[PDB]
Design an enzyme around this catalytic site. Structure first.
Site, PDB file in Angstrom:
ATOM      1  N   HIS A   1       8.671  -8.257 -40.584  1.00 36.89           N
ATOM      2  CA  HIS A   1       9.855  -7.610 -40.040  1.00 36.89           C
ATOM      3  C   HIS A   1      10.981  -8.630 -40.107  1.00 36.89           C
ATOM      4  O   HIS A   1      12.059  -8.353 -40.611  1.00 36.89           O
ATOM      5  CB  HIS A   1       9.669  -7.159 -38.594  1.00 36.89           C
ATOM      6  CG  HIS A   1      10.890  -6.732 -37.841  1.00 36.89           C
ATOM      7  ND1 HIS A   1      11.055  -5.400 -37.465  1.00 36.89           N
ATOM      8  CD2 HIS A   1      11.986  -7.326 -37.309  1.00 36.89           C
ATOM      9  CE1 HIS A   1      12.182  -5.250 -36.806  1.00 36.89           C
ATOM     10  NE2 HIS A   1      12.801  -6.408 -36.690  1.00 36.89           N
ATOM     11  N   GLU A   2      10.700  -9.784 -39.487  1.00 39.70           N
ATOM     12  CA  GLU A   2      11.830 -10.719 -39.317  1.00 39.70           C
ATOM     13  C   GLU A   2      12.245 -11.322 -40.656  1.00 39.70           C
ATOM     14  O   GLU A   2      13.450 -11.480 -40.894  1.00 39.70           O
ATOM     15  CB  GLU A   2      11.490 -11.786 -38.281  1.00 39.70           C
ATOM     16  CG  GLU A   2      11.347 -11.260 -36.852  1.00 39.70           C
ATOM     17  CD  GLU A   2      12.647 -10.702 -36.314  1.00 39.70           C
ATOM     18  OE1 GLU A   2      13.718 -11.134 -36.797  1.00 39.70           O
ATOM     19  OE2 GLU A   2      12.648  -9.832 -35.398  1.00 39.70           O
TER      20      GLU A   2
ATOM     21  N   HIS B   1      14.764  -9.290 -42.532  1.00 44.42           N
ATOM     22  CA  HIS B   1      16.195  -9.385 -42.243  1.00 44.42           C
ATOM     23  C   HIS B   1      16.898 -10.303 -43.246  1.00 44.42           C
ATOM     24  O   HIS B   1      18.062 -10.100 -43.595  1.00 44.42           O
ATOM     25  CB  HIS B   1      16.413  -9.877 -40.819  1.00 44.42           C
ATOM     26  CG  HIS B   1      16.172  -8.876 -39.725  1.00 44.42           C
ATOM     27  ND1 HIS B   1      16.829  -7.676 -39.691  1.00 44.42           N
ATOM     28  CD2 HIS B   1      15.366  -8.901 -38.634  1.00 44.42           C
ATOM     29  CE1 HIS B   1      16.433  -7.004 -38.605  1.00 44.42           C
ATOM     30  NE2 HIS B   1      15.549  -7.709 -37.965  1.00 44.42           N
TER      31      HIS B   1
ATOM     32  N   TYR C   1      24.980  -5.801 -37.622  1.00 44.37           N
ATOM     33  CA  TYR C   1      23.989  -5.634 -36.562  1.00 44.37           C
ATOM     34  C   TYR C   1      24.558  -4.974 -35.317  1.00 44.37           C
ATOM     35  O   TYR C   1      24.502  -5.503 -34.209  1.00 44.37           O
ATOM     36  CB  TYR C   1      23.389  -7.008 -36.216  1.00 44.37           C
ATOM     37  CG  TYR C   1      22.372  -7.514 -37.198  1.00 44.37           C
ATOM     38  CD1 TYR C   1      21.012  -7.257 -37.018  1.00 44.37           C
ATOM     39  CD2 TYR C   1      22.743  -8.257 -38.312  1.00 44.37           C
ATOM     40  CE1 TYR C   1      20.069  -7.729 -37.919  1.00 44.37           C
ATOM     41  CE2 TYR C   1      21.798  -8.725 -39.212  1.00 44.37           C
ATOM     42  CZ  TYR C   1      20.458  -8.464 -39.016  1.00 44.37           C
ATOM     43  OH  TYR C   1      19.518  -8.919 -39.919  1.00 44.37           O
TER      44      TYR C   1
ATOM     45  N   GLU D   1      17.392  -2.651 -38.462  1.00 46.29           N
ATOM     46  CA  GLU D   1      16.152  -2.779 -37.695  1.00 46.29           C
ATOM     47  C   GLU D   1      15.038  -1.909 -38.260  1.00 46.29           C
ATOM     48  O   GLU D   1      13.916  -2.360 -38.425  1.00 46.29           O
ATOM     49  CB  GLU D   1      16.347  -2.375 -36.235  1.00 46.29           C
ATOM     50  CG  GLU D   1      16.654  -3.491 -35.264  1.00 46.29           C
ATOM     51  CD  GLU D   1      15.506  -4.500 -35.252  1.00 46.29           C
ATOM     52  OE1 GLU D   1      15.827  -5.552 -35.810  1.00 46.29           O
ATOM     53  OE2 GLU D   1      14.388  -4.288 -34.721  1.00 46.29           O
TER      54      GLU D   1
ATOM     55  N   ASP E   1      22.231  -3.516 -26.110  1.00 43.95           N
ATOM     56  CA  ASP E   1      21.459  -3.708 -27.346  1.00 43.95           C
ATOM     57  C   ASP E   1      22.365  -3.475 -28.554  1.00 43.95           C
ATOM     58  O   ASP E   1      21.980  -2.868 -29.554  1.00 43.95           O
ATOM     59  CB  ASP E   1      20.218  -2.824 -27.318  1.00 43.95           C
ATOM     60  CG  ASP E   1      19.273  -3.035 -28.476  1.00 43.95           C
ATOM     61  OD1 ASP E   1      19.132  -4.171 -28.957  1.00 43.95           O
ATOM     62  OD2 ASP E   1      18.663  -2.048 -28.927  1.00 43.95           O
TER      63      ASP E   1
ATOM     64  N   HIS F   1      17.823  -1.544 -31.500  1.00 44.91           N
ATOM     65  CA  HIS F   1      16.371  -1.540 -31.414  1.00 44.91           C
ATOM     66  C   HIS F   1      15.828  -0.247 -30.793  1.00 44.91           C
ATOM     67  O   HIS F   1      14.602  -0.170 -30.685  1.00 44.91           O
ATOM     68  CB  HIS F   1      15.783  -2.659 -30.560  1.00 44.91           C
ATOM     69  CG  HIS F   1      15.968  -4.031 -31.094  1.00 44.91           C
ATOM     70  ND1 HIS F   1      17.084  -4.774 -30.774  1.00 44.91           N
ATOM     71  CD2 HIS F   1      15.210  -4.788 -31.919  1.00 44.91           C
ATOM     72  CE1 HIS F   1      17.001  -5.954 -31.386  1.00 44.91           C
ATOM     73  NE2 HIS F   1      15.876  -5.973 -32.071  1.00 44.91           N
TER      74      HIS F   1
HETATM   75  O1  LIG Z   1      10.727  -8.312 -34.715  1.00 44.74           O
HETATM   76  C1  LIG Z   1       9.935  -8.595 -33.599  1.00 44.74           C
HETATM   77  C2  LIG Z   1      10.130  -9.773 -32.885  1.00 44.74           C
HETATM   78  C3  LIG Z   1       9.354 -10.012 -31.746  1.00 44.74           C
HETATM   79  C4  LIG Z   1       8.379  -9.101 -31.351  1.00 44.74           C
HETATM   80  C5  LIG Z   1       8.198  -7.943 -32.089  1.00 44.74           C
HETATM   81 BR1  LIG Z   1       6.892  -6.709 -31.593  1.00 44.74          BR
HETATM   82  C6  LIG Z   1       8.966  -7.672 -33.211  1.00 44.74           C
HETATM   83 ZN   LIG Z   2      14.670  -6.992 -36.276  1.00 44.22          ZN
END
Ligand SMILES: Oc1cccc(Br)c1
Ligand SMILES: [Zn+2]
Ligand SMILES: Oc1cccc(Br)c1
Ligand SMILES: [Ca+2]
Ligand SMILES: [Ca+2]
Ligand SMILES: [Ca+2]
Ligand SMILES: [Ca+2]
Length: 316
Positions: A142-143, A146, A157, A166, A226, A231
């Site tokens: 996921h991260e 980005h 964002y 996201e 947020d 998110h």
């Molecule tokens: O993108 C993230 C970062 C931290 C926790 C979770 Br679940 C997802």
């Molecule tokens: Zn993210």
């Protein structure tokens, strides 16, 4: 650093043994030369000065508790690299084999992981809400996703463009988890979230509402917290993506599923050719339709299924 490529062995956060690519020069470092310009993992030593120091180990064996988050950050960066290269012909996040750098042991009891514009950063969690976050392959990918989003579409964002940003990361985080094919699902963060509660996650793509996120545009969050719900409102797009892949009938609208690999090809193409920094949900739909048109034809089932999915979550 400069040295010789070697292969170390260790255990990750969940106790699983794996081999990792290291580099020898007096010590063994978490430096993988086999991918692009390198994958590098650092120790932030419970502080927030980044990146910290390149991870060094005397004997190439990484079985200490302290080692486990590094093992997984390093390994899952490799898996993510391999996904993008093998599946989308993309060489790292800039497309030109940019070095991938990650720091673990960030701060104390830090229940998050993030991309800081230049590198990955992983907390160890507080042991109740989260365990070390690099234990989650969906979290890692996921991260890392980005980084490519920022390099390509550049979705800002906040508000709808942020929620798309996201969702894109949840989408490819999940497809990397299926790629690695260890207990894959459409939930996010289940392997590191709430060690004392089984079966839960932070978010769900298959049923965003399980954890209070909207699964229809009419249920979107309109407030300022947020960053305008990035998110939260991601659930609308996550549900659309889930339906495109898996099918289903949602608020009375039926979607014929076309599977994960076509989902991935359509959203990868949308991300890299049609989305822009201020794209909104309607524009995402148009991009996904055009992408599926490019790949499978104007008349394909794939295009119809994309249209059905967006119809199902209320996005015109
Ligand atoms: O993108 C993230 C970062 C931290 C926790 C979770 Br679940 C997802
Ligand atoms: Zn993210
Ligand atoms: O965002 C990306 C794209 C390709 C490789 C890796 Br690792 C991260
Ligand atoms: Ca050691
Ligand atoms: Ca899983
Ligand atoms: Ca998952
Ligand atoms: Ca749990």
């Amino acid at each position: 650093i400069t040295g010789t490529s070697t292969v170390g062995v260790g255990r990750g956060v969940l106790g699983d043994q794996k081999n990792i690519n290291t580099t020898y020069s007096t010590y063994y470092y978490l430096q993988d030369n086999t991918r692009g310009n390198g994958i590098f993992t650092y120790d932030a030593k419970y502080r927030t000065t980044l990146p910290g120091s390149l991870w060094a180990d005397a004997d190439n064996q990484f079985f200490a508790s302290y080692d486990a988050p590094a093992v997984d950050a390093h390994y899952y960066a490799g898996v993510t690299y391999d996904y993008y290269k093998n599946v989308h012909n993309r060489l790292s996040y800039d497309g030109n084999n940019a070095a991938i750098r990650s720091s673990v042991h960030y701060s104390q009891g830090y229940n998050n992981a993030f991309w800081n514009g230049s590198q990955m950063v992983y907390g160890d969690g507080d042991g109740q809400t989260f365990i070390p976050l690099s234990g989650g392959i969906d979290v890692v990918a996921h991260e890392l996703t980005h980084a490519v989003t920022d390099y390509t579409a550049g979705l800002i964002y906040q508000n709808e463009s942020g929620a798309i940003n996201e969702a894109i990361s949840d989408i490819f985080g999940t497809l990397v988890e299926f790629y690695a094919n260890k207990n894959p699902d459409w939930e996010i963060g289940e392997d590191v979230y709430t060690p004392g509660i089984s079966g839960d996650s932070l978010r769900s793509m298959s049923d965003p509402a399980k954890y209070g996120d909207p699964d229809h545009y009419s249920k979107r969050y309109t407030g300022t917290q947020d960053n305008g719900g990035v998110h939260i409102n991601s659930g609308i797009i996550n549900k659309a993506a889930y339906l495109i892949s898996q099918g289903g009938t949602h608020y009375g609208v039926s979607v014929v599923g076309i599977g994960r690999d076509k989902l991935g090809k359509i959203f990868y193409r949308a991300l890299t050719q049609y989305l822009t920094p201020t794209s909104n949900f309607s524009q995402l739909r148009a991009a996904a339709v055009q992408s599926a048109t490019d790949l499978y034809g104007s008349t394909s089932q794939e295009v119809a299924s994309v249209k059905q999915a967006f119809d199902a979550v209320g996005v015109k």
